[PDB]
Curated annotation (Swiss-Prot):
Involved in nucleotide metabolism: produces dUMP, the immediate precursor of thymidine nucleotides and decreases the intracellular concentration of dUTP to avoid uracil incorporation into viral DNA. The keyword Cell membrane does not apply. It catalyses: dUTP + H2O = dUMP + diphosphate + H(+). Signal peptide: none annotated. GO terms for biological process: dUTP metabolic process. This is Deoxyuridine 5'-triphosphate nucleotidohydrolase. The keyword Protease does not apply. Substrate binds at D73, R81, R155, S156, G157. Keywords: Disulfide bond, Hydrolase, Magnesium, Metal-binding, Nucleotide metabolism. Its cofactor is Mg(2+). Its EC number is 3.6.1.23. GO terms for molecular function: dUTP diphosphatase activity; metal ion binding. Monomer.
């Protein structure tokens, strides 16, 4: 059913063109990404996830750059920031128009204000050397929620250190959470460190097929993310 209150937002940033159920910004100037370091894009963008929903923020490029896929919580009242990492050992440049920045809604449930995800504790110690990708197997099934699919997203704090999580479905036999260290340090994550977050997405948001108003970039190679069809409505007073 069509049950999305507007997404209220305010936007101001002369280095990004607002193009825009999905808001998209394009870069106007070249963005240089240092290697081995986190690159951050300040968006000038404020946005209220409407009732029942969270927001998903992600960068899309065909350059050798990986975006953190951001979960925006209903309680978040600040300016949105995009987190990028460089796949290469030298500077990578994003020429104008090469980077699109998307924001769109999704319905979520919370199992038995108020964050979307539940942070997940690492069951083992994990070391990651510069540029290594490794996975952590999670075995114990989370509680089933009718009409929703458990999915793993990364956290921004770890993303800022250069550790990205590939978003993925937590399928009924367990999950392999892939982490990539984009930094110049060996990172040691201690057992019980909260290393990602579990989000129960409404099943409508995951599709194995090329549907309208969906995107193959976000959740992996075998799904597309299909967002809630909501209307963005500019409320400048949100800025701050
Ligand atoms: O790419 C992103 C991701 C998140 N956020 C904002 C919205 C979100 O509600 C908040 C916290 O993000 P996250 O939950 O990923 O951070 P954390 O490391 O889990 O910190 P916290 O414990 O405060 O949630 O930061 C962004 O601006 N950009
Ligand atoms: Mg969080």
């Amino acid at each position: 059913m069509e049950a999305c209150p507007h997404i209220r937002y305010a936007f101001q940033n002369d280095k990004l063109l607002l193009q825009q159920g999905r808001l998209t910004l394009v870069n106007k100037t070249t963005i240089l990404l240092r290697p081995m370091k986190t690159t951050t894009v300040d968006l000038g963008l404020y946005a209220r996830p409407p009732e029942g929903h969270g927001l998903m923020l992600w960068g899309s490029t065909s350059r050798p750059v990986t975006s953190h896929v951001g979960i925006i919580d209903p309680g978040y009242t600040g300016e949105l920031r995009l987190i990028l990492q460089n796949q290469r050992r030298y500077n990578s440049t994003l020429r104008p128009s090469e980077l699109k920045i998307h924001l769109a809604a999704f319905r979520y449930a919370t199992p038995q204000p108020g964050d979307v995800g539940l942070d997940v504790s690492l069951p083992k110690d994990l070391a990651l050397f510069p540029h290594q990708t490794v996975s952590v197997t999670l075995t114990v099934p989370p509680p089933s929620i009718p009409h929703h699919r458990p999915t793993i997203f990364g956290r921004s704090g770890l993303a800022m250190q250069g550790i990205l999580v590939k978003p993925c479905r937590w399928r009924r036999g367990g999950v392999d959470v892939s982490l990539t260290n984009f930094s110049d340090q060996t990172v040691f994550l201690n057992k019980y460190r909260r290393f990602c977050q579990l989000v129960y997405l409404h099943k409508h948001h995951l599709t194995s097929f090329y549907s309208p108003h969906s995107d193959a970039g976000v959740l992996g190679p075998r799904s597309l993310f299909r967002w809630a069809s909501c209307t963005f409505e500019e409320v400048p007073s949100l800025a701050m």
